[PDB]
């Protein structure tokens, strides 16, 4: 059995800085004591600086254990757990490889709920963003049964340059968005981020070689609002790639429930070999939502980074199977896969959208249910079933073997299928 965090001087309270005590537990487990295991019994554990995870350690937390984020330093990350060293900006360090870390149970309160004004986080006034994990250059990482409360315009989890990562049976509740944020900064806030390892993408380290993430599964988890703040913008994805980034591959997103996102459940550019299967996406009406995007939304959005100069490795091998969407927002698309402008040099291909079910019961629906745009070869769109809305399927400017077979369309007002030239 495990090194207890209390034995190392963590006090259960709102108030005492437990950073050191917790770090000391971890450092001892790292050596092999308590057999790599660390246990957090019931409490609220305030940390006022970053805690470092260590190779071959396994943390388990009581259901009534919370980690409370009290990192409140100007020009400094406010991320509770990192898999490598960070002190201050401009003192970044290469992160060596780390492996075999597991983290299980309890809450992390990322503590970013807004002030009564809505310009800054109540308890963490000096910060620019809050979040729970920065996983860079790691292997075999399990995050399981955890409740993630209230990131402040930030990524609850960042998975950068990391292999064999699992997110299981967790919940993500609350993303806090200042009134002042422009749309471009809002939609870059994925709650779980899966990205190549670059300094621009992952500013916590020196690693800049663009190494991919690999074999990354997000499953059996729930994403929505909290009591203290509104709905996640984008549950899972990424919004950056370049000629030097190697594309995150074998990405499985399965059996999750994306409850009323502002923008997306899954939105990404630069992935290869992804599976989005048996998920549930709900989107409520503007009126029943704390957060809502007036420029509109797309629950699955496999899109193409804005570059007109380079031949990018754009999305390939995306499978979107057996999901179900209930949409009551007239402004929301269920499924979008795109090369967004004819001006982009890369190709998007091997795209299969199958056995999905969409109930769109919105009033005066302004959007198509499924949109495939500039897909170059191997496109299958099959045995999907679509209940309600204006247009059904739209396939636009697509070359190659295109299979469209045995879809069903019900009580749609506008065009079922629609091929555009
Ligand atoms: Ca520091």
Numbering used by the authors: 139 to 559
Question: What text comes from the article?
Answer:
PfbA (plasmin- and fibronectin-binding protein A) is one of the most recently identified surface attached pneumococcal proteins. Recombinant PfbA was found to bind to the human extracellular matrix proteins fibronectin and plasmin with high affinities (KD of 4.1 and 2.4 µM, respectively), and may therefore be classified into the microbial surface cell recognition adhesion matrix molecule (MSCRAMM) family. Mutants of S. pneumoniae R6 lacking the pfbA gene were deficient in the capacity for adherence to, and invasion of, human epithelial cells. Greater insight into the overall structure of the protein is provided by a solution SAXS analysis of a 509 amino acid multi-domain construct of PfbA that includes the PfbAβ and an N-terminal domain of unknown function. Together, the results reveal a protein with an extended architecture that contains a core parallel β-helix structure with specific molecular features that we propose are most consistent with the recognition and perhaps processing of carbohydrates.
To this end, we have determined the crystal structure of the 422 amino acid core PfbAβ domain (residues 139–560). Therefore, diffraction data from the C2221 crystal form that contained only one monomer in the asymmetric unit was ultimately used to complete and refine the atomic model of PfbAβ to Rwork and Rfree values of 20.9 and 25.3%, respectively. PfbAβ displays a right-handed, parallel 12-stranded β-helix fold that is preceded at the N-terminus by a helix-loop-helix arrangement comprising residues 139–171. This motif is followed by a calcium-binding site, which appears to stabilize the initiation of the β-helix and is established by sidechain contributions from E187 and H214, and the main chain carbonyl oxygen of T225. PfbAβ possess a distinct groove on its surface that is conserved in location with the substrate binding grooves of β-helix carbohydrate-active enzymes. The PfbAβ groove runs the length of the protein face, ∼50 Å, is open at one end and ends blindly where it is blocked by the N-terminal helix-turn-helix motif and calcium-binding site. The PfbAβ groove is most pronounced over ∼28 Å, up to the blind ending, and over this stretch is lined with a distinct series of electropositive residues (H293, K320, K327, H377, R405, R431, K444, K471, and R474) and tyrosine residues (Y378, Y401, Y441 and Y443). Last, there is a sequence-conserved motif comprising Q296, Q331, E333 and G339, which coordinates a well-ordered water. Thus, though PfbAβ displays significant structural similarities to polysaccharide lyases it does not appear to share their function.
